[PDB]
Write an enzyme that holds these catalytic residues in place. Structure first.
Site, mmCIF file in Angstrom:
data_model
loop_
_atom_site.group_PDB
_atom_site.id
_atom_site.type_symbol
_atom_site.label_atom_id
_atom_site.label_comp_id
_atom_site.label_asym_id
_atom_site.label_seq_id
_atom_site.Cartn_x
_atom_site.Cartn_y
_atom_site.Cartn_z
ATOM 1 N N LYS A 1 -1.664 -8.284 -4.434
ATOM 2 C CA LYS A 1 -0.396 -8.953 -4.181
ATOM 3 C C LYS A 1 0.006 -9.741 -5.420
ATOM 4 O O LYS A 1 -0.829 -10.040 -6.269
ATOM 5 C CB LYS A 1 -0.542 -9.896 -2.981
ATOM 6 C CG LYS A 1 -1.671 -10.879 -3.139
ATOM 7 C CD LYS A 1 -1.886 -11.716 -1.887
ATOM 8 C CE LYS A 1 -3.054 -12.686 -2.074
ATOM 9 N NZ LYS A 1 -3.181 -13.709 -0.994
ATOM 10 N N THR B 1 -3.978 -10.643 2.834
ATOM 11 C CA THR B 1 -2.708 -11.293 3.136
ATOM 12 C C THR B 1 -1.862 -10.428 4.070
ATOM 13 O O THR B 1 -1.561 -9.269 3.775
ATOM 14 C CB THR B 1 -1.933 -11.601 1.852
ATOM 15 O OG1 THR B 1 -2.843 -12.130 0.878
ATOM 16 C CG2 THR B 1 -0.846 -12.640 2.123
#
Length: 282
Positions: free
Chosen positions: A136, A168
């Site tokens: 990410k 996440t």
């Protein structure tokens, strides 16, 4: 042999770059060389109590095995009675995410460039049978020269033949929510999300809470703004595919060759991305 083990006194510790439940990363300057390192500090007591030995050990091992310009390098390790220290390269510019907010979204030349760096970093990582599992914008840092430096391998999985972790929420792949498992394709899915976020300014699946987010992911519920670069849209659609065996770039789809051949990367020279001057970010 090698240089004697380093010790805390050899450095002048500075500001905290970031924190985790697991540890703290602080900017340090080595006295004898004046070199700046980002040192990850972990409390052995906390790690043992939380049953993270396997994690910390795996993290250090994965990093030791990587020797590429797109990955934060591990230069040394040492410990005292209570803490472990890992000397990592320092990427001054911080999180790619910062740059995303700073300018809203990336134009086509910048999206292409940074995506290419990430794809190329993934080909290298996967080539060593390693899966990040938590890719990410916040894990993708930028060095002083604005080239990427991927890090945080605390959630990595080393293949031997990958279900014990999540990652996440906004970047989680559908298989992780279903078959409770993960593979190389999982990173490729994260790539699809990241690409989308570079062009649109926000990740694809968004909602009030984790549960809602997961609902949209397993239903592939998201859409493109009408301004989305056509070829990038096409590429993203080939990555955000529910079936992990049908994502562009995975083994079943014949690897990285087809991915790098995608029209969106038409003008990219894969052989020396790191020698190239990154496009000015707007």
């Amino acid at each position: 042999p090698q240089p004697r083990k380093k010790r805390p006194e050899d450095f002048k510790f500075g500001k905290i770059l970031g924190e985790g439940s697991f540890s703290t990363v602080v900017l340090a300057r080595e006295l004898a060389t004046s070199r700046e390192y980002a040192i990850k500090i972990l409390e052995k007591r906390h790690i043992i109590k939380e049953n993270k030995v396997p994690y910390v050990t795996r993290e250090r091992d994965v990093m030791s095995r990587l020797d590429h310009p797109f990955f934060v390098k591990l230069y040394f390790t040492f410990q005292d009675d209570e803490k472990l220290y890992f000397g990592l390269s320092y990427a001054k510019n911080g999180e790619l995410l910062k740059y995303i907010r700073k300018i809203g979204s990336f134009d086509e030349t910048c999206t292409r460039f940074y995506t290419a760096e990430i794809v190329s970093a993934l080909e290298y990582l996967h080539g060593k049978g390693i899966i990040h599992r938590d890719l990410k914008p916040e894990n993708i840092l930028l060095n002083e020269d604005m080239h990427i430096q991927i890090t945080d391998f605390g959630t990595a999985k080393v293949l031997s033949p990958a279900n014990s972790f999540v990652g996440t929420a906004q970047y989680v792949s559908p298989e992780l929510l279903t078959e409770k498992s993960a593979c190389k394709s999982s990173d490729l899915w994260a790539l699809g999300c990241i690409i989308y976020q570079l062009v649109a300014g926000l990740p694809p699946f968004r909602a009030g809470n984790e549960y809602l987010i997961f609902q949209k992911i397993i239903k592939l519920e998201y859409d493109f703004p009408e301004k989305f670069f056509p070829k990038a849209r096409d590429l993203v659609e080939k990555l955000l595919v529910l079936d992990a065996t049908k994502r562009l770039g995975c083994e079943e789809m014949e690897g990285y060759g087809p991915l790098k051949a995608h029209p969106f990367f038409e003008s990219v020279t894969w052989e020396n991305l790191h020698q190239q001057t990154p496009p000015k970010l707007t």
